[PDB]
Design an enzyme around this catalytic site. Structure first.
Site, PDB file in Angstrom:
ATOM      1  N   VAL A  32       0.860  -1.179   0.000  1.00 47.70           N
ATOM      2  CA  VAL A  32       0.000   0.000   0.000  1.00 47.70           C
ATOM      3  C   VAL A  32       0.898   1.231   0.000  1.00 47.70           C
ATOM      4  O   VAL A  32       1.818   1.344   0.813  1.00 47.70           O
ATOM      5  CB  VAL A  32      -1.056   0.014   1.145  1.00 47.70           C
ATOM      6  CG1 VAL A  32      -1.988   1.223   1.025  1.00 47.70           C
ATOM      7  CG2 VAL A  32      -1.874  -1.270   1.143  1.00 47.70           C
ATOM      8  N   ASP A 136     -12.929 -11.544   7.610  1.00 48.90           N
ATOM      9  CA  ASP A 136     -11.634 -11.157   8.169  1.00 48.90           C
ATOM     10  C   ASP A 136     -11.736  -9.902   9.053  1.00 48.90           C
ATOM     11  O   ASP A 136     -10.955  -8.964   8.911  1.00 48.90           O
ATOM     12  CB  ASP A 136     -10.534 -11.047   7.084  1.00 48.90           C
ATOM     13  CG  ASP A 136      -9.108 -11.228   7.599  1.00 48.90           C
ATOM     14  OD1 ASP A 136      -8.940 -11.692   8.758  1.00 48.90           O
ATOM     15  OD2 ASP A 136      -8.165 -10.922   6.843  1.00 48.90           O
TER      16      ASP A 136
END
Ligand SMILES: CC(C)n1ccc2ncnc(N[C@H]3CC[C@H](N(C)C)CC3)c21
Length: 277
Positions: A32, A136
């Protein structure tokens, strides 16, 4: 729907996908990167079988197109011409990192922690109302905007009493049935219970250099009267009060019921967290 970005535009706004940390464009590790489109800061995730990754890319966009809410991370665009996903930048990072005070950020107050727990439950409620299972839920997947508003993140595993041969998720947060291959919104509740314990205690879900190693096991220590919730309250707060901490713990304890059908649904979790404040 969503706009496409040229791979070269994203490459150019992340200083050629500069893998060096921001302190020295890398924010996390696919990888990222921090980017800037016009006068807007963005988060660019560069995805790293190859067929399975493309399915996760397509699936995530599909979930993001359907799920737009105040407590969900917003997708701004994508690139498939190498795969990239562009999101609204969350300046206060993850709840995991704020709970650990990573990079010297000040501890979150009990007041802020309550708002974040409520916000996260609101995001999960939107997902469950719209027949999506996150799969998740964890503090690393709860991002925080400019006002510390909770934003549920990472819909890469999200799915619209079903079984799977490919068991996915994060072991320290997973419900017993999820570890066995079941796919149910009841497992998201269990994982949220672990997040609530992280909020109360400031402790990570798993710590190899800790007794117990798994945070969820403190429920048993408290139930067997070996410890109290008071013993585990994060010492990095000055504004926690016994009543509301016990109220959040009661919610966490209910979420963490070993039997999936005995757990509260997300609407009940929201109600209980609202009653707490
Ligand atoms: C969904 C995610 C890719 N995302 C979407 C928007 C956004 N904005 C800021 N950061 C993000 N991810 C960080 C990854 C690294 C994390 N740590 C330092 C390890 C902290 C959180 C964002």
């Amino acid at each position: 729907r969503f706009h496409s970005f040229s791979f070269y535009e994203l490459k150019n706004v992340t200083n050629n996908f500069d893998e060096r940390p921001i302190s020295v464009n890398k924010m996390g590790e696919g990888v990222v990167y921090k980017g800037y489109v016009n006068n807007t800061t963005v988060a660019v995730k560069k995805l790293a079988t190859t067929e399975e990754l493309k399915q996760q890319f397509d699936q995530e966009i599909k979930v993001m197109a359907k799920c737009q809410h105040e407590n969900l991370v917003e997708l701004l665009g994508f690139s498939s011409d190498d795969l990239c996903l562009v999101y609204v930048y969350m300046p206060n990072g993850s709840l995991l990192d704020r709970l650990s005070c990573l990079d010297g950020t000040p501890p979150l107050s009990w007041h802020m922690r309550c708002k974040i727990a409520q916000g996260a439950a609101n995001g999960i409620n939107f997902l469950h109302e719209n027949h999506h299972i996150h799969r998740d839920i964890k503090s690393a997947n709860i991002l925080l905007d400019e006002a510390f508003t909770a934003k549920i993140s990472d819909f890469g595993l999200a799915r619209a009493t079903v079984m799977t041969s490919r068991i996915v998720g994060t072991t320290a947060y997973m419900a017993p049935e999820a570890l066995r291959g079941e796919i149910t919104p009841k497992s998201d509740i269990y994982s949220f219970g672990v997040v609530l314990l992280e909020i109360i205690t400031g402790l990570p879900a798993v710590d190899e250099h800790r007794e117990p190693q798994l945070l969820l096991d403190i429920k048993e220590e408290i139930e067997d009267e070996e410890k109290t919730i008071e013993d585990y309250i994060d010492k990095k707060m000055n504004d926690a009060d016994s009543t509301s901490v016990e109220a959040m713990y009661s919610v966490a304890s209910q979420c963490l019921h070993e039997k999936k059908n005995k757990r509260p649904d997300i609407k009940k979790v929201q109600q209980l967290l609202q009653e707490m404040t």
